[PDB]
């Protein structure tokens, strides 16, 4: 129940990331979902570009 | 042999099947070294990408994830997923 | 049934809402650009994504229909651009899997020609067809669409629009319009290559040549650009209508229609009319916006490619960079 | 100047008033009559089409001049070709003499199948036709549309002497691309006018491609046409 992902190339070490989503009941989780969208974009960029 | 697995949590299996399908059948402009593995598990969707060069890798990642984001904005503006 | 023609190919986007024989909504945000810079795979996509939900909602509220009153999601199967089409597509596939609709691929050019069949309403005429990516003289012969006129390099739409580009005219609404109404005020036409090689054209020789004019149009100051406008009007409209009546009398046809990237011009209407009077043939009119790549034409061609029963494999479909109308299997007609 | 053109109007009215129909259509006018005692016929290209002046004259002029040059170079090379009298492009007229023995390779293939079964003498006609088309393609004067109805025969009716005519849609810069285009139109004419002559056409193809040391890139470009439809 959270935006969950994991990268392993030939490093053999787990690069596991995940971010929480908006708990429903005060709104739809999709807002926290787009939040995690932006988050994962930032993460994949800042990790892979350098 | 760069591998990248990711578990998107959805509310219902409806979004599981949808976001599995609506991005699978495209033989991507670049699968030359990229394998797209879309496995639905309940209401979660696991997706595993396989690549050999990180540039087109990142392009696939972010392009997909924004096709995702667009499925999301549609499930906010037309959805959330209807029972089918 | 209703069809969401989800077209955007290179510099365009649009939602053709086709239902009950009318193109209810053909909205757009013509991706108008700095002078003569376009044909984008990337920012076309950025633009189209940013605006596409807005355009969907616009077309839907104009039509007043719901996500359960639309009956098809026709994405342009090709030949478009790479990223513009997949970004066009993911919405098509998603609203299909969600609204409970089927993904359907549709050829691009057959869309132009089907909207022409809605424009003409004549007995299976040959069609000179030209857009930003086509130079064909077509007739539906032997169960398929037969290519009698085929370029190798460029296209009358592509040609006239790249010309109006390299002269930095106001890209809106269509460079063709600018070269059309920029014409009448120039004289002293010249001789540019006339290359008709039996039933096939090679428009490349046209375009490049006019480029080599601009230099001496500024280095000597003894010629105006309106000259170039009227001259290319006369020349290329001649070539096209000449081979049109030729391949017309060949197949026993006396009809002619011009659709696509350059149909906005009216000089072509005149020359087609004259070649028709002389050889006893009849012409058909033309227009600006309809022969510009809306989203309505792909919805139209989807009406046929979909009413028949042609479905795309839900497990494989989408990206194309060439998809020819004799690589098709047209079935809705014998 | 316009006075000479009025006199030309007068002569065009005089020579061409009271003559029977021969044929007229679509980039061709053709009549028939006498010339100083001899027999002759007429072939006419024209600035009689209206799209724009200042080119239409150039158009008709270059058209008829090309046809005249083609007939001359053809019959002077050695190919059997008709004889021309004089070329007055001031109205784009053509006076061509008739060669007697009116029969086409179309008519031959039509008639000789009554005695021929599993074509053998027709395959030999195909041998000869390949010989003569390679002979034309020695310096590659493109008939621009080879056909079964474009090959006449002059007697004797045994040595197969045949004439090639109507070089109006012509050019001599032969590109194996356009050459394959020609050979394709050729095969299409075979299949259309003649049902299932694969033995005939194969005899013909082998005869030509043997008698012609050039058909290889031509047929390769033809194969290129086969996968794109040109």
């Amino acid at each position: 129940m959270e935006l969950l992902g994991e990268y392993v190339g030939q490093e053999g070490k787990p690069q596991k990331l995940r971010v929480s989503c908006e708990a429903p009941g005060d709104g739809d989780p999709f807002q926290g979902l787009l939040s995690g969208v932006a988050q994962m974009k930032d993460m994949v960029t800042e990790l892979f570009d350098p | 042999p760069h591998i990248f697995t990711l578990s998107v949590p959805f509310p219902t299996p409806l979004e599981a099947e949808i976001a599995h399908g609506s991005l699978a059948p495209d033989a991507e402009p670049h699968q030359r070294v990229v394998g797209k593995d879309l496995t639905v598990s309940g209401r979660i969707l696991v997706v595993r990408w396989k690549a050999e060069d990180c540039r087109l890798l990142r392009i696939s990642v972010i392009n997909f994830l924004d096709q995702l984001s667009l499925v999301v904005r549609t499930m906010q503006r037309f959805g959330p997923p209807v029972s089918r | 049934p209703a069809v969401l023609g989800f077209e955007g190919s290179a510099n365009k986007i649009g939602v053709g809402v086709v239902r009950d024989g009318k193109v209810l909504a053909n909205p757009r945000r013509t991706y108008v650009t700095p002078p003569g810079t376009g044909f984008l795979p990337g920012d076309t996509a950025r633009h189209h994504r940013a605006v596409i939900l807005d355009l969907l909602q616009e077309a839907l509220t104009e039509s007043g229909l719901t996500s359960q009153d639309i009956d098809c999601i026709a994405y342009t199967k090709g030949p478009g651009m790479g990223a513009p089409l997949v970004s066009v597509a993911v919405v098509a596939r998603t609203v299909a899997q969600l609204w409970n609709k089927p993904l359907v691929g549709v050829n691009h050019c057959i869309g132009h020609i089907e909207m022409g069949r809605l424009i003409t309403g004549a007995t299976s005429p040959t069609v000179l067809y030209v857009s930003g990516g086509n130079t064909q003289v077509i007739a539906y012969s032997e169960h398929r669409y037969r290519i009698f006129g085929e370029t190798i390099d460029i296209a009358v739409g592509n040609c006239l629009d790249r010309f109006a580009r390299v002269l930095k005219i106001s890209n809106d609404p269509s460079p063709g319009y600018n070269i059309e109404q920029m014409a009448k005020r120039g004289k002293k036409l010249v001789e540019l290559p006339y290359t008709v090689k039996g039933m096939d054209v090679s428009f490349s020789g046209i375009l490049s040549f006019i480029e080599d004019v601009a230099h001496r149009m500024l280095a000597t100051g003894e010629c105006t650009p309106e000259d170039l406008c009227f001259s290319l009007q006369e020349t290329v409209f001649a070539m096209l209508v000449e081979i049109t009546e030729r391949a017309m009398a060949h197949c026993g046809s006396q009809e002619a229609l011009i659709v696509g990237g350059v149909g906005c011009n009216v000089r072509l209407q005149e020359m087609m009319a004259t070649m028709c009077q002389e050889r006893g043939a009849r012409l058909f009119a033309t227009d600006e916006r309809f022969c510009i790549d809306n989203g309505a034409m792909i919805a139209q061609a989807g009406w046929e490619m979909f009413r028949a029963g042609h479905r795309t494999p839900l497990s494989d479909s989408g990206v194309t960079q060439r998809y020819r109308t004799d690589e098709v299997e047209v079935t809705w007609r014998d | 100047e316009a006075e000479a053109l009025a006199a030309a109007r007068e002569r065009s009215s005089r020579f061409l008033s009271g003559l029977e129909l021969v044929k007229q259509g679509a980039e061709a006018r053709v009549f028939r009559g006498r010339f100083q005692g001899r027999a002759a016929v007429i072939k006419h290209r024209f600035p009689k089409g209206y799209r724009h002046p200042a080119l239409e004259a150039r158009l008709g002029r270059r058209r008829t001049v090309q046809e005249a040059r083609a007939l001359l170079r053809c019959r002077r090379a050695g190919i059997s070709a008709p004889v021309v009298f004089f070329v007055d492009y001031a109205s784009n007229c053509l006076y061509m003499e008739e060669i007697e023995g009116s029969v086409t390779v179309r008519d031959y293939i039509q008639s000789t199948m009554e005695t021929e079964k599993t074509p053998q003498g027709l395959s030999n006609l195909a041998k000869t036709i390949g010989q003569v088309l390679a002979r034309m393609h020695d310096e590659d004067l493109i008939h621009g549309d080879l056909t079964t109805s474009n090959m006449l025969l002059k007697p004797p009716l045994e040595q197969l002497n045949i004439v090639l005519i109507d070089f109006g849609l012509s050019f001599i810069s032969a590109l194996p691309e356009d050459k394959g285009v020609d050979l394709y139109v050729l095969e299409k004419a075979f299949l259309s006018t003649h049902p299932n002559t694969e033995t005939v056409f194969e005899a013909f193809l082998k005869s030509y491609s043997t008698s012609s040391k050039k058909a290889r890139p031509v047929l390769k470009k033809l194969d290129e046409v086969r996968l794109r439809g040109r």
Binding site: - | - | - | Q36, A68, R69, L72, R76, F85, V87
Partner: protein, 174 residues
């Protein structure tokens, strides 16, 4: 002699005469140039038929009665319109009368009432009247085809009338 009814600009009447027993260089050529001879004087040893003359004379009539012609006189035009050699110097010199003949062909073209007495010219030039069937006898093929240089392969499928016709058609566009 015999008179005809030309076509393709028909307003003229062409007439041919054949004479013999001539030997002189300057006086007769000057007689021709001075117009005191109103016919057109040609050697007999390069011609094959009166039909070549007829075609060249029709060329002359047509290009004259428009004035567009390179020429200005009907008489001198046919002589160039026989030889397809675009170098008009030799197309006038050789194909015309030289001092290498004991016989001459005369071509006259008549319009309306412009009449030139026959006995007048018969007196003007020395020679005996001979009928027009003597062409093949003086015809020396060894030198006739020297100006055509035509291929025997073309001769295989026809006569030498149309072989010499097919090439006189093309000296104008090229």
């Amino acid at each position: 002699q015999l008179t005809h009814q030309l076509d393709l600009f028909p307003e003229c009447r062409v007439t041919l005469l054949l004479f013999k027993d001539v030997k002189n260089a300057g006086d007769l050529r000057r007689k021709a140039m001075e117009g005191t001879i109103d016919g057109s004087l040609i050697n007999p040893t390069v011609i094959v038929d009166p039909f070549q003359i007829l075609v060249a004379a029709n060329k002359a009539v047509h290009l004259y009665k428009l004035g567009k012609m390179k020429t200005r006189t009907l008489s001198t035009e046919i002589i160039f319109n026989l030889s397809p050699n675009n170098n008009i110097s030799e197309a006038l010199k050789k194909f015309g009368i030289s001092a290498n003949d004991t016989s001459i062909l005369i071509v006259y073209i008549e319009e309306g009432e412009k009449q030139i007495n026959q006995e007048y010219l018969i007196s003007q030039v020395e020679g005996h009247q001979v009928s027009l069937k003597n062409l093949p006898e003086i015809m020396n093929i060894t030198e006739v085809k020297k100006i055509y240089k035509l291929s025997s392969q073309e001769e295989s499928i026809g006569t030498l009338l149309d072989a010499i016709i097919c090439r006189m058609s093309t000296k104008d566009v090229l």
